[PDB]
Structures are given as C-alpha cells and as structure tokens.
C-alpha cells in the first residue's frame, strides 16, 4: 500500500509492472475547484481541501470537447480522441514516480496539443510510465480547459477574461511547486514539454511573469507562440464572443449579462455553435485561443520576443519532416487517405483558397510562384508535394526556426532538431510521410516495449531520444554521452546548426528551409 | 578480407572487421554485403582523397570537394551496387544533354550544372553556377571541412565526410 | 569538521580534501556529491580518480556480488531484507573470508566492494556528470607517479619477483595480460600487445618487463587522471597537474620497480624533514618544497613556492596541457604526458 501526504490531504496510488521493475502511478489527483455553474469561464479557484484518502487509481474525466468524426473506425485519427468521459469537472493531474522512490528527482511536465479545442492527458501515447522506469525522472501531466470553456474572452471583465486554460496549466505548475517534494521530486528542477498547441503553451509560459518561477527549462515540439494559428487578436476574440452569444440566442446589452446567459446553456449547445463563429474556418482553425489579456500575457508576444522580455534559460526546439500532410485530408480537394492524391494545378490553386481564405489574389499567386518552380521532371506527385510543404512551412517549421533565432540572440543555449523517421506502424498512407504528431510515441518510449511490434532500429532510436530529453531536463545539455553518439551543437544565428534524428545516421546540418522561410518570414507578413 | 588484404596480418584483418561490423543494428541481412563495399571504397578511394585535400589546402590554396551521389537511370549493373565507381564521368562529359539518349530530364539538368561548374573552374578557379540560383560551393579548409553533395534533388552543404572511418584508415591502419 | 573545527582554531571555510588511490577517487566523488558541495573548498587528487577503471561498480555487478556473498555464507534468502538480516548474524571473519571470491575472475587490482550509483550519494553514472559539467566548481591539484603499475606485477603476473630482476619473455607478457584483463577478448588483448611492443628497439631484454608495468600504470592510473583533469578544467576552473619522479633512497622494493605507486605520500607528509630518519639532504629539500606547494594550494588555490626562486607551476588547460615534474635535481615544465598511450586507452579501448 502506497499513501503520500499532500498539502490538501492524502492520496493513494497503484503499483505497475514495467520492464522487470516497478513504477508508482497517481492518476487523477484534483488540482482546483471544479469550474462548474457560477465558476464557468472564470479563472481556476483553489481547492477546498480534504480528509480521508483520495484514491488516485484511474484516469479522470477529460475536459468538454468536440470530437474528430471524419474517419470513424480508423486508428490513425481515433487515437487522438478522449478515452475518459467528458465533463466540466476535469481539473485533474497525473504523477508517475520511479520505484524505489527517488530522493530528489528531475521532473518533466507534459502539456498536450489539440489546437486549443481538444486534447486530454490520459492518451496512450502520453503515458509517463516508461520515462519514469527508464530514466528515473518523475513525470506529470494535467487536464486544462479547451475551446470556449477555456479561452472565451471579453477582456477586462473577470467573468470571462480569456486565457483560463493557460491559468489552469499555471495552477498545475503551482501544485508541483508546493507538492512534488512529498513524492520524491525536486521542485527546483522542472522542465516543461509539450507538442503543437502544447508547445505554443510552454512558449507562452516563458513570457508570463507569473510562470517565471514555476519551472527551469523548456522543450517545444512542433509549435510555438509566433505560429500564425497561436494567438487570437483582441479584435477577433470580441467578434467571436459576440457571434457565439448571437448563435445561442444569448445576445444581451450589458456585457456581464451575456456571460450570465451563457452560464445557463448546457455544454452541448456551446460546443455545437463554437464551430461557426468564424465565417471562414480552415483545417487549422483555432476558434478560441490565447489572447492578450493584460494578465497572463501583457503585450503582443511578437514584441516581447523581439525585445528580449522572456525567461532566460535553455530551450530545445524541433519539428517533423512532413508537418503539413495531415491537414490536407480534412478538406483540400483531391486528397484522400485512401489513395495517392495526385492533384492537378487547378486543385493546388483551389487548395490555397481552403488554407488562406482571405488573403488576396496576389498573396495567393505569390505562394504558387515560390513553391511551383519545377526542378523538374513532371513528376506527377509535384503539386501534391508542394501543398504539403506550403502548409508545414507556414504553420510549423518557419515559426519554430524564427522563435529559435530570436530566443538565442539574447545569450541562451538553444538546441534544434529535425525529426525524420516514419514509424513502421503509422496507419496513414506513404505519401503522408513523417507526419505531424508522430514523434510523440518516440519521446515517451513506446518502442522500448518489445511486444509492441516496433523494429529493433526503432527501439534504439527511442532509447536515444529518451536519454537526450532527460539529460536536457537534468543538465540543460541533450547529449548521449556513452555510446559514441553524434554531438548536438547549440543553435546560434549566423550558422544555425541542427541535428537530424533518424534510424540510420544522425547528421549535423545547417540552415533548415533557408529559401522557404525567407519567403514566409520577410515577404508574406506584408500581404 | 583475405581477397582484398592478402597479407596483412590476422590482427590487421580483425581490426577491419571490428571497426566495420558494430551493428546499428536490426539484422538486416544486407549488412555484411554493405560493410565490405564500404571497406573497399573507404580505404582505396574516399579516405585518401580527403587526406590529399586537407594536406594540399593547408598550404594556402583554395580547394573544393564534392560527393557524387546520383545513380544513373541507365546503369546496367544491379541496384545493390549503388552509385558506382566510374559513373560520374558520363555526367561530366555531358551525355545526358543528348535527349535521344534516354536519360531523365532531372538527369539532363544535373549534367548541365556539372558542366557549368567544371568549366567555371577551369576558366576562373571557382566552380559556382552563378545564374540559376544554385547552392554556393564553399572552399574546403581543415577544421571545418565543408563539401557539396551532387544529386538530382537538392544540393547540400555538409561537413566531415566519413569522419569515423577515415580516422581508422589514416591513423590506425598504416601501422599494421 | 564543519561544526567543530572553530573550537580547535580552524577555519571551517577553508578546508582542502586530499587523498591517494581509492582516497583520491573518494575526494573526486565528493566533488560530484550534492551533499558534499558545502563541506569543503578545494581538492588534491594523488594517483586516483573516480573515472579509473577500478573505481565504480555498476549496479549490475553489485547485485551479482551481494547475491554471491549470501550464497557463500549460506545466507541465500528470498525476501531481500531477509538476506541482509541473515548477514547481520554472521561474525565478521566469515564475511571477510568470502569477500575474496564473489568475483569469478579477480585481478591484483580487484575492488570486490566499491562505490555504486546509489541514487543518494551519487545520482547518475559519474562519466556523465563529469562530461556535462555537473560538479563543484573549484581549483584542483592532480598528479601521478612515474611507475604506478610496477607494484601490482608481484601479486601474480608470471615471471615477476621482488627478489630478482624479473626479465620476462613474450609468452610471459602475453600471459601477464590474461591476469590483468581476464575477459576482455582475444583481439582486445592483441591490441594492447601491438600498441606497447613496437620496439625502439635494441633487445634490450628488460623490454617486456618494462612494457607490462607501463600497460598497468597507463590504464589504471595515469590516463584516467589526465582525462579527469582535461574534463574538469574545461568548465573554467584552474587545475594543476604534477608528475612525481623521485625514487626514495629508502624504498625497500628493488630497482626495476622504480618510482612506485604510493611512494610520494611520505614526501607530502614531510617525513624527510626529520633528520634522524636517514633521508638524503636533497630529499629533505624536495619534501620542504612539496609541503609548501601543497599548503599554499590549500590556503590560496595556487601551489607556488614563491621565495626560493622556484619554477612556476602553470595551470593545466586543454590544448597545451602543461604539467610540472617533481624530482631532486631540476623541476621542469613539460607538455602532453603519455600523449600516444592515452589516445589508445581513452578512444580506442572503451570499445572492446
Ligand atoms: C464578424 O462578425 C460577422 C458574423 O457573421 C457571421 O455570423 C455568425 C453567427 C456565423 O454564422 C458566420 O458564418 C456569419 O458569417 C461577420 O459578417 C459576416 O461575414 C460574411 C462574409 O463576409 C457575410 O457573408 C455574412 O453575411 C456576414 N454576416 C453578418 C450578420 O454581418 C464579419 O465578417 C466578422 N468579422 C471577421 C473579421 O471575420
Ligand atoms: C482520390 O480520392 C478522392 C476523394 O474522394 C473519393 O474517395 C475515393 C477513395 C473514392 O471513393 C471516391 O469515390 C470519393 O469521392 C477523389 O476525389 C474526388 O474526385 C471525384 C471526381 O469525380 C469527385 O466525386 C469528388 O468531388 C472528389 N472529392 C474530394 C473531396 O476530393 C480523387 O479523385 C481520387 N484520386 C485518385 C484515385 O487518384
Ligand atoms: C554472476 O554470478 C555467478 C557466480 O558463480 C560464482 O559463484 C561464487 C560463489 C564464486 O565461488 C565464483 O568463483 C563462482 O564462479 C557467475 O557464474 C559462474 O561463472 C563461471 C565462469 O563463467 C563459471 O565457470 C561458474 O561455474 C559459474 N557459476 C555458476 C553457479 O553459475 C557469473 O559469471 C557472474 N557474473 C559475472 C559478470 O561475473
Ligand atoms: C625470478 O623469480 C621468479 C619467482 O618465483 C621464484 O622466486 C625466485 C626468487 C626463486 O626462489 C624461484 O625458485 C621461485 O619459484 C621465477 O619464476 C618462477 O620460475 C620457475 C621456472 O622454473 C617456476 O618454478 C615458477 O613457476 C615461476 N613462478 C612464478 C610465480 O613466477 C623467475 O623464473 C625468476 N627469474 C629470474 C631469476 O630472472
Ligand atoms: C535537491 O536539490 C536542490 C537543488 O538542486 C538543483 O539546483 C538548482 C538551482 C538547479 O541547478 C537544478 O537543476 C539542481 O539539480 C537542493 O537545494 C535541495 O535542498 C535538494 N533537496 C533534497 C535532497 O531534499
Ligand atoms: C576566519 O576567516 C573567515 C573567512 O576566511 C576565508 O574566506 C573564504 C570565503 C575563503 O576565501 C577562505 O579561503 C578564506 O581564508 C571569516 O569569515 C571568519 O569570520 C574568520 N573567523 C575568525 C577569525 O574567527
Ligand atoms: C480505495 O481503494 C481500496 C482498494 O483496495 C478500497 O478498499 C478503498 O475502500 C477505496 N476507497 C473508496 C472506494 O472510497
Ligand atoms: C451590468 O449589470 C451587472 C450585473 O449585476 C452590474 O454589476 C453592473 O454594474 C451593470 N453595468 C451596466 C453598465 O449596466
Ligand atoms: C548504450 O549502451 C547499451 C549497450 O552497451 C545499449 O543497449 C543502450 O541502449 C545504450 N544507451 C543509450 C542511453 O542509448
Ligand atoms: C539556367 O538557365 C536556363 C533557363 O533559364 C536553363 O535551362 C539552363 O539549363 C540553366 N543553366 C545552367 C548553366 O545550368
Ligand atoms: C519482507 O519482510 C520484511 C522484514 O520484516 C517486511 O518488512 C517486508 O514488508 C517484506 N516484503 C515482502 C515482499 O515479502
Ligand atoms: C627557503 O628558504 C630557506 C633558506 O633561506 C630554506 O632552507 C627553506 O627550506 C626554503 N623554503 C621552502 C618553503 O622551501
Ligand atoms: Cl526534406
Ligand atoms: Cl494559371
Ligand atoms: Cl548517432
Ligand atoms: Cl552553410
Ligand atoms: Cl531545406
Ligand atoms: Cl541547387
Ligand atoms: Cl560539424
Ligand atoms: Cl559520413
Ligand atoms: Cl617516463
Ligand atoms: Cl605471437
Ligand atoms: Cl625548482
Ligand atoms: Cl607541445
Ligand atoms: Cl610521455
Ligand atoms: N502510432
Ligand atoms: N495532433
Ligand atoms: N553508362
Ligand atoms: N573504371
Ligand atoms: N617508505
Ligand atoms: N597503496
């Protein structure tokens, strides 16, 4: 039997067998007042506190969210859908600790992605047990509010001030500060890591003065707050708060009265309308997201970054080889997971209308011009390949690289990777390549599990990723020092070195997508 | 190894086996086939070329190093032989420029660019393709050891070709 | 010492650790231990460091050995705490008697029971902490003796004796290697022979005798000391390296053993200062100078003899790698000790 005593009271966990040893897990410890009724859309309030043992033995409720139903029965997409009941009562966290219980261990805190409208910490590919077993770190993950329930904003007004889900995260980091010593963890050695919207969130915790003292270092996988999809302008957040009220028939006059109407609506009504508060959405749409609230975020983050107003520490930033491909099957014409999707020039041009709804004609011509100068054969997979590249370069790779240059210019060590292995188990077809989101299983160490049908080469690559990530958390240097591995150089402007991760040979390369990012970073902002 | 290092001691030959058969990893049956190709190429061709280039450049002259990696779409030898010894020559002399010849368009483009670079080298001592927005070819210095890859897709600037392998051939093996 | 030395006149804020062999490896480990960071100022490592091949036991072999001892004392239990409990009844002679063969192949260098990665004193494999600069930032003074290896050769290498000159044949050298690298592959052992028996040249019968001494000293002592010093200094601290090369005029071991492992200690503690003791005058002078340098190091972090026109001791940096020789005649500034030999042990040999 395993009871730990926290500030708010006692929690019981369970023991798990993992690769011949043991891990202790506490799944679903509460970390705030559930945000129900009167507390909907408000910031997260502090826990009432208890007596008796809370049984932290199963995953908790995932937060209310719309579900992906485009490929029912298909593992490639259902793997990202929630696997616990949905409910407004969802402010919970998970801890995995090594056994025997550590003395003063480093802590990794996961923050899931999901375009800020979805996600949950209880997914299979986020299971922290392997990291705890293998590297003797403690792993933590939290559930945070997504969609309007988490990011609806009417700024000033504390009834719905914006950024609620980010404060949910902040208060979870807080919990770790106060409580992790009891579980064996070092509150002075905490690394945040996250993917996609999770990576943008971690990047925003670097800007937030209220987060400065709640963590040590940061890992950003395929995401950063300067990505075009990451922050909503105060302007559009109003248009959207108002469009939702109109749609639910909640249109009031006094602003606090709108919010009050919205607190009576059952959560299904709110999810159902969320979808079209934008008049032209894309597969990348973030209906309800971070905003400049004047609390969590004090100014436009482009500005803070440019002028070096962030926490000074080491970062590890990286991206996948085919980030864009995954979004092409959610509505670009001529694309299918069930065929090779050879597309014509007309279909490419139309594809652009789907991804840059408006965006002028000249703007769109200029993307076509810079991505369709053929080198050369024809080569029918040519427009198919270009559209993938456009969506990945613009949304993921170029803003990651631009974040890294800017951050490092202020004197901190930065490390950049380019992940290029296609998983031998991927359920999406070949032409989709090394997809957005498919490094995660590598980082959490699933290929370490032999029954799992990964290749040996894949096991080796995972074990090495795990070591590098863990050395980063504990030391700020992501080397594999023992098995004669390639040394990972720091990223400076001027040279811009980065490391490639694959099953064959790791390489040191320079200036990823130099040509493409000159386009997105200096030309395109002006259209 | 007995065929390629007739004598050459037992320990000498064990040391080649040791440095080229530490498996990374799968098994992966094409493994010893691949290693023997690499042993003969590294020892006979690649490592002495790289060592010549370092030494020559250390005396103040500009040097330019390439790594040719395109397998000709017409090669009559089978796949496992890859980008063979001697099969860049047709590229340098510009045979793929001839359209009747059944080379791919991509191959025509790569040849035209090799020809320009070789010719700019002869006339100017600088093997750039200056007009069609080509990758710039950096000079080879010791310390950094940059070189240019030549292929039909994307030319890259890389550093330190076969670093591990050539440490073996250049500093360990002369002593056996 | 932290709590009590003020009462005796001592400065708890000025403490230098110093130790030899396993003592030197221990001091080096106190530099890694977060619980020791605030208990001392500076460190002196004589012939020993935690990266030496004999210094840390892997968690793996420590289990095999705990279990082999229980089996041997007839203490083999099932519940782990029950094994320990059995072992607490055994009288200490029974435990010493079996300690000896919990290893199936021991060497004269064997460390049956040693430091391990406990997750308390030591939180990770020390190779890693060193490489990634996770140690106490301070000055160190590190050094080694000219013939570290010779002493271990008389505890079981065939053809060796303190009572003769131990001229050995090639077969005896090859066999010697089986004693010191029990397993260790055939190719591994051939590669030691190859790199230490390319003759320069005469023959010269003391040749294989000399090489085997050098193999054991280079691998166990000198090369890991030098590698520790490079790595430590790369993180910005002053480091000072010495090469001790005086054979004591009183040494009771024979000539061919040279400047043995352990025979600088009497110099450091100042025994030759005692005149009745039958050391030479030259030896008195050398001791007095070692004592001053060690003491200036403790109080100041700089091991100079400033008054009697002594040779200045340069700091050790990577790139140049200067070190000071200590002998009765002339102290010299030299560079890159055992450059050739350590390239072998440090980059080639870990891979066998
Ligand atoms: C800010 O608000 C209006 C919202 O109009 C929208 O009403 C929502 C409830 C939703 O159903 C949505 O699809 C609908 O369009 C935007 O004005 C609309 O814009 C479109 C295209 O310009 C017109 O064809 C609509 O008829 C028009 N509707 C109204 C009522 O005016 C407005 O564009 C938006 N601002 C931005 C920047 O997107
Ligand atoms: C690849 O398939 C797409 C996707 O749409 C189709 O899914 C296919 C697997 C098949 O079942 C097809 O019947 C289904 O419509 C094809 O795109 C579609 O093309 C046809 C043209 O006649 C139209 O009916 C659709 O408007 C169009 N829709 C979309 C959403 O793309 C595509 O042609 C096909 N390409 C191949 C096989 O190379
Ligand atoms: C881990 O444990 C066993 C221990 O075997 C040993 O038993 C001790 C009590 C001691 O007397 C010792 O000398 C004895 O060998 C090792 O297995 C042994 O290995 C040797 C050589 O390989 C064999 O010839 C023994 O018969 C064999 N004994 C048994 C009982 O298996 C084992 O090798 C060891 N692991 C390591 C890495 O050294
Ligand atoms: C130096 O002596 C060694 C050590 O063993 C010997 O000790 C000698 C001083 C002497 O008393 C001798 O009788 C005693 O055995 C000699 O090695 C030994 O050589 C003989 C060969 O006939 C064997 O009996 C032993 O197996 C062997 N043993 C060991 C443990 O080394 C060595 O030959 C001698 N060398 C000289 C004098 O140059
Ligand atoms: C646990 O270690 C504490 C400090 O360790 C950390 O120091 C930080 C400043 C940062 O360098 C981290 O990455 C270090 O690992 C120490 O202050 C505590 O007292 C320790 N507590 C224990 C053992 O209970
Ligand atoms: C004794 O001296 C104390 C400090 O001396 C030391 O300062 C350390 C930081 C380090 O530089 C040492 O090597 C110095 O020699 C001082 O703080 C005490 O108060 C003194 N106490 C006495 C005289 O009782
Ligand atoms: C929590 O867990 C244990 C399971 O052994 C159970 O016996 C205990 O009463 C549980 N508490 C509950 C359900 O409140
Ligand atoms: C709007 O009504 C709220 C809700 O009780 C009240 O507190 C606030 O003072 C009102 N403001 C205006 C401008 O009508
Ligand atoms: C390094 O060492 C072992 C074999 O010696 C290997 O199996 C392991 O996976 C490697 N370690 C890391 C951290 O990659
Ligand atoms: C550059 O220009 C033309 C087209 O503008 C092209 O066909 C030609 O092959 C290129 N020149 C070289 C030297 O590669
Ligand atoms: C083993 O016995 C000890 C000694 O009293 C006890 O405390 C422990 O709980 C036991 N564990 C197992 C797994 O039998
Ligand atoms: C320096 O000075 C005296 C003689 O002037 C000498 O005997 C002494 O041993 C020397 N001091 C040191 C510290 O070596
Ligand atoms: Cl690419
Ligand atoms: Cl057109
Ligand atoms: Cl590698
Ligand atoms: Cl470059
Ligand atoms: Cl690129
Ligand atoms: Cl090019
Ligand atoms: Cl490099
Ligand atoms: Cl290479
Ligand atoms: Cl010498
Ligand atoms: Cl022989
Ligand atoms: Cl002197
Ligand atoms: Cl020199
Ligand atoms: Cl030397
Ligand atoms: N997967
Ligand atoms: N995702
Ligand atoms: N050919
Ligand atoms: N040839
Ligand atoms: N002595
Ligand atoms: N000793």
Short mmCIF file of C-alpha atoms in Angstrom, two decimals, chain C residues 266-277 279-280 283-289 291-292:
data_model
loop_
_atom_site.label_atom_id
_atom_site.label_comp_id
_atom_site.label_asym_id
_atom_site.label_seq_id
_atom_site.Cartn_x
_atom_site.Cartn_y
_atom_site.Cartn_z
CA UNK C 266 55.90 10.19 2.80
CA UNK C 267 57.06 13.21 0.78
CA UNK C 268 53.74 15.06 1.12
CA UNK C 269 53.50 14.45 4.92
CA UNK C 270 57.08 15.61 5.39
CA UNK C 271 58.91 12.64 6.81
CA UNK C 272 62.26 13.63 5.15
CA UNK C 273 62.11 16.80 7.21
CA UNK C 274 63.08 14.51 10.09
CA UNK C 275 66.95 14.34 10.02
CA UNK C 276 67.42 11.24 12.26
CA UNK C 277 65.31 9.44 9.63
CA UNK C 279 66.87 10.54 4.10
CA UNK C 280 69.34 12.44 1.91
CA UNK C 283 65.32 14.59 -0.29
CA UNK C 284 64.74 16.97 2.66
CA UNK C 285 64.81 19.91 0.27
CA UNK C 286 62.30 18.28 -2.13
CA UNK C 287 59.91 17.48 0.71
CA UNK C 288 60.00 21.00 2.17
CA UNK C 289 59.08 22.34 -1.24
CA UNK C 291 54.86 20.74 1.66
CA UNK C 292 54.95 24.46 0.89
#
